Symmetry: C5
């Protein structure tokens, strides 16, 4: 088992780490159609999404995806500093696999 | 894949962007039969709803409608500024498809 | 399609608007069998309930009842002002059908 | 239907009211198997539990047991004053049946 | 039934109590497949996880695992002081069984 987000991320293909050390600038949520988009941005211009549970996700996934959307909403509202994101780089915007919060 | 609410909104039919840049003025919630719904207003007089699911949309669409009502409630309670709403034009009050929050 | 709580409340036969324009004074919650309910009061002495979900309710009605209890708890704890309640008056305490929150 | 926690308490055998008028001093929860429970204390030393779900509980109580643990956690974190607890006294720690919050 | 977290911890093999008396320093969560977990750290360096759900868990723990992750996220965001953790010491990071918050 990995002990931090950087190690976790490296277990996967098509992932990298972004280091933000900043609060979320904007939060966007859609209920429309299949994609039900959740989009976060940072003041540096970085943009990320959370993808809906879909054909590419195994069943344990479903709850973790909902949780991650919950986390991003509360993080945004509380102005909590995001340390790092682990993202899939083969989607645009890059899709969030994990988040760390510190400071 | 869109990267912001304006581009997301343009993919949908008979929608439009309202730019509020304001916190929500009032929040209304009903549990009464077949009117299980939520209405928000803004100080400029604008009124919007989260539509009742019906029995016709699918399970993930259900979850997203619940999440949107959760978002509106917490936005209202925290006085979070709503940047834009993407809404369908064919209902009165207009039904919300998406929301962005930013300062 | 109603646009505010007063017009929603008017759709029904046994309902009435109460105008509080005040924070909730007390919040009570029970897990005891057949009394899985919430009760709120205001400083003017008014008492209202969220009804026990029985076998008469369908899922979406049970979901909206759970949402209403969630709303009332966080309204209590944030000292949010309650504008109006739509209640069924054929129950003691009167049972909540809808809530509106505004300053 | 009862209009307050005292009257609700009295509908059940093996219960009593404790009047705290104080915030929760500590909050404990467990995911360990067969000990999926919460425990709260007050500054005067008094200990109370939310029981592990079991054969004593009817199905309607399962959502309410979860809701109670959610209420105790957020009451704790917000330092909300607990007015009264209705507890079963045939268990140690005494088992929460209902809570009221007021100033 | 145990009266406090220390006594609860003593009922299980491969556990120990850590007394932190400190806020959470960092919070990490993942949605990545087979790593649907959370990781927290303290300023003293200690690392803990909420395990991926697995064949070690019984059905009654599934809700409590989700709850614990909720707990840890909101504790972190509110800077709540963690008093003690009860953890399984046969895993790295050590796996959370129970948490107490006080002071
Ligand atoms: C089965 O035991 C009794 C049932 C009843 C009647 C019905 C019932 O529904 N009781 C629930 C009580 C039990 O569940 C509660 C949670 O819901 C809680 O855990 C209580 O500690 C437990 O006794 C009355 C009794 O004394 C006169 C009983 O003796 C202990
Ligand atoms: C380690 O295996 C033992 C199991 C048992 C019996 C029950 C048991 O361990 N239950 C759950 C422990 C496991 O699940 C936990 C989550 O619930 C958690 O993941 C733990 O790390 C894991 O060991 C007894 C032992 O000592 C005599 C054991 O040590 C060899």
């Amino acid at each position: 088992t990995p002990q931090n987000i950087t190690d976790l991320c490296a277990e996967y293909h098509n992932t990298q780490i972004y280091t933000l050390n900043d609060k979320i600038f904007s939060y966007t949520e859609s209920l429309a159609g299949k994609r039900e988009m959740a989009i976060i941005t940072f003041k540096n211009g970085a943009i990320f999404q959370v993808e809906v549970p879909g054909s590419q996700h195994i069943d344990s996934q479903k709850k973790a995806i909902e949780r991650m959307k919950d986390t991003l909403r509360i993080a945004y509202l509380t102005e909590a500093k995001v340390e790092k994101l682990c993202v899939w780089n083969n989607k645009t915007p890059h899709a969030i696999a994990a988040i760390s919060m510190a400071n």
